[PDB]
Design a binder for this molecule. Structure first.
Ligand SMILES: CC(=O)N[C@@H]1[C@@H](O)[C@H](O[C@@H]2O[C@H](CO)[C@@H](O)[C@H](O)[C@H]2NC(C)=O)[C@@H](CO)O[C@H]1O
Ligand SMILES: CC(=O)N[C@@H]1[C@@H](O)[C@H](O[C@@H]2O[C@H](CO)[C@@H](O)[C@H](O)[C@H]2NC(C)=O)[C@@H](CO)O[C@H]1O
Ligand SMILES: [Mg+2]
Ligand SMILES: [Mg+2]
Ligand SMILES: [Zn+2]
Ligand SMILES: [Zn+2]
Lengths: 403, 403
């Protein structure tokens, strides 16, 4: 295959999500949906009376559901969060200003999301394609927590004053805004709950979100495919425009990202309504895109496989990454996987490479790594593979407590 | 050792927790704390200004913290939950009445509990002895979700009208109250989120909870040890009094429970205040109990070890259960565990035996079993070990869809 495309749809479930799902199903592809459950509460200020129908359809159809936070951080866009806050924030268009504030509260929005999803669909955990507790994406933010060595932030994603498309807006990736600094801490809190978070390579969107009637300015399928071709193996998160969409320190050439392109789009762009003639204009683009992408030799996959699942009978090279039971691992040596050689906290063939900061077993730590253990921070003074009896509080050769 | 005692303390963290912990520390034991975070918000109507200090002290001292729900189900004791609700329910004493209503909302209380703990103590996940997301106990209810074949419910725990100790109160285990039925679904919801729940063998308590000044009538250390001795291998959950503390269908003789006694008590009983002189009277009883139990040949363990942890080097017999990373597994083959053979979703030496009802990988299913899969229920028609390819919807020879 020329490469793998991951269609990711953010900000559903809304009425428009239904026909989108239908197109994916007619196109013969699975996608990943990053949902905000406030639409199920009917307070997300969209056409959303079919929200639960959409959720069920997405899952019944075998699409992956991931966590996009309960309310898309709209609580940070308003004075007091309530039923009108979505409309209120839509009135101002201030979504990317002060987007993140209290990272603890903001991370909690991800847990609340799951409460709400599991309330409206009490059976959701019986779907293996429900990954709301393993996979996440941050509102506004091309930020990544994939592996211990594959982590990077959207350093201009959100602002403390001006919108990124306004005159006078300035960003200094070396000195990110307060909103971005909070969003980084949110990334880290989720990683410690065992989430992976992913950004994107390309965005099926208007040039910027200041553009009026956004749904009326999506790229056609062919040019969009050209854009995908361009993004393939070209470290697209660093070159992407506009500036607030970049991941400046994305690890170019990282093997996990090779031959892959993650597409971001929004369900709401596929609706005839207040953003333009999205259903009429853009549903066919999506149908055509999927068709011509396959013809070009691309395959489509979902974000639960972005990190390839560990698989018996597969030969791994030392240093290769797999996903196993929601946990990322790294091959200690080149070998062919056997049934009883699975990655674990004691496997000799694998070390844990989750993108977390809490001290964890069977991790290959490097000098300078900082870990959290029983509420204190410790510098890794000597590189080692962690194990149960080498806890940072009692192993002063391996760890030094920070001041 | 004669046996293992699991000291388990419910309803914290409160001011009284501090000196409880200290006595445990002085006695050289670890215990398990089933906490309700509403005390951290200061609305649980106890002396609880030191609630955070207590939480930190339990964790720092190495005690296990488990989930008891955010508000101990007081939202079901009042018409509108708020800051005064604890007080309001304490005025009427109606805690065991309609305690469980909407099982989905009630289960969500357990997840809200974790959000609140992680708000007041944002480093809490960096403690390995933090087991809030793995171990739980339902308010009022001697119910168990331990393994696929070790589950039983408290069929008279809560009522639809009278307090259990009132004249006129009747309970029929064969025809359980609606509150009991709701609690049974809560159990099942939690299990499908990967929780184990455990009840208790003996309760260090007043005769029943209608007893005024309940802290004043706590069994002395020596007689309490007698109660424990009697509980050892005697299926105490079936013989326990009062009626509402029973687990009527507890699997007597079940291998995981042999030589073990789980003790329930409440931090609030060790306080000098509104329930009697608990610190003065009861802390010394705790201290002495710990001392004499050790002398009698008992050891103390915590609930994260109740299902013994899989350990490299240990020999297991086919049919034995272990816990590994929060998941129960049953040995397929008698053997001596090695590094590379951790129990898992793909092990040929272990099958998953979590007490869940959702279809799950690598479970030894038996004809008659019923599983949930993508929102539908299926009857196991032929015994088999589940695997990724053998999903209920595509295996009409292994499963039969139910109406
Ligand atoms: C991945 C991501 O979060 N991208 C951002 C978009 O979600 C976002 O648009 C706004 O989303 C809100 C939540 O659904 C809507 O309430 C709001 O109406 C919508 N704004 C417009 C103009 O449609 C956009 C724009 O703020 O930014 C992306 O970064
Ligand atoms: C483990 C368990 O749930 N045990 C039950 C106790 O929680 C319960 O006592 C009551 O607990 C509430 C929650 O902390 C308190 O608000 C309430 O004041 C307290 N009752 C008294 C009289 O102190 C008891 C009795 O309701 O039943 C147990 O089964
Ligand atoms: Mg994970
Ligand atoms: Mg578990
Ligand atoms: Zn979004
Ligand atoms: Zn309780």
């Amino acid at each position: 295959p020329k490469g793998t495309i991951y269609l990711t749809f953010s900000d559903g479930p809304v009425n428009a999500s239904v026909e989108v799902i239908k197109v994916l199903n007619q196109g013969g592809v699975k996608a990943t949906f990053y949902f905000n459950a406030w639409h199920l509460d009917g307070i997300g200020d969209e056409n959303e009376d079919r929200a639960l129908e959409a959720l069920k359809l997405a899952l019944d159809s075998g699409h992956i559901v991931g966590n996009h936070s309960y309310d898309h951080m709209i609580h940070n866009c308003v004075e007091e969060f309530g039923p009108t806050s979505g409309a209120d924030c839509n009135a101002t268009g201030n979504h990317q200003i002060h987007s993140y504030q209290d990272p603890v509260r903001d991370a909690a929005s991800f847990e609340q999301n799951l409460i709400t999803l599991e309330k409206y669909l009490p059976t959701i955990r019986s779907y293996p394609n429900y990954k709301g507790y393993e996979l996440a994406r941050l509102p506004y933010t091309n930020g990544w927590r994939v592996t211990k060595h594959f982590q990077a932030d959207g350093l201009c994603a959100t602002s403390d004053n001006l919108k990124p498309w306004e005159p006078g807006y300035v960003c200094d990736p070396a000195n990110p805004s307060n909103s971005v600094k909070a969003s980084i801490q949110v990334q880290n809190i989720l990683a410690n709950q065992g989430y992976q978070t992913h950004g994107w390579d390309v965005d099926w969107a208007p040039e910027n979100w200041g553009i009026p009637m956004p749904a009326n300015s999506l790229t056609e399928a062919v040019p969009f495919l050209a854009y995908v071709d361009k993004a393939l193996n070209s470290c697209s998160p660093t070159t992407i425009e506009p500036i607030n969409s970049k991941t400046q320190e994305f690890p170019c050439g990282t093997p996990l990202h090779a031959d892959k392109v993650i597409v971001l789009t929004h369900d709401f762009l596929f609706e005839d309504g207040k953003r333009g003639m999205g259903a009429t204009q853009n549903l066919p683009k999506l149908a055509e895109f999927i068709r011509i992408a396959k013809e070009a030799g691309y395959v489509f996959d979902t974000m639960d496989n972005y990190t390839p699942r560990w698989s018996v009978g597969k030969t791994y090279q030392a240093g290769e990454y797999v996903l196993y039971q929601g946990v990322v691992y790294k091959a200690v040596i080149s070998h062919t996987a056997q049934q009883d050689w699975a990655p674990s906290s004691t496997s000799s063939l694998w070390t844990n490479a989750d993108p977390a900061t809490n001290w964890t077993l069977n991790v290959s730590y490097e000098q300078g790594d900082i870990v959290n253990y029983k509420g204190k921070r410790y510098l890794v003074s000597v590189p080692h593979v962690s194990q149960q009896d080498w806890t940072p509080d009692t192993q002063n050769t391996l760890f030094t407590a920070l001041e």
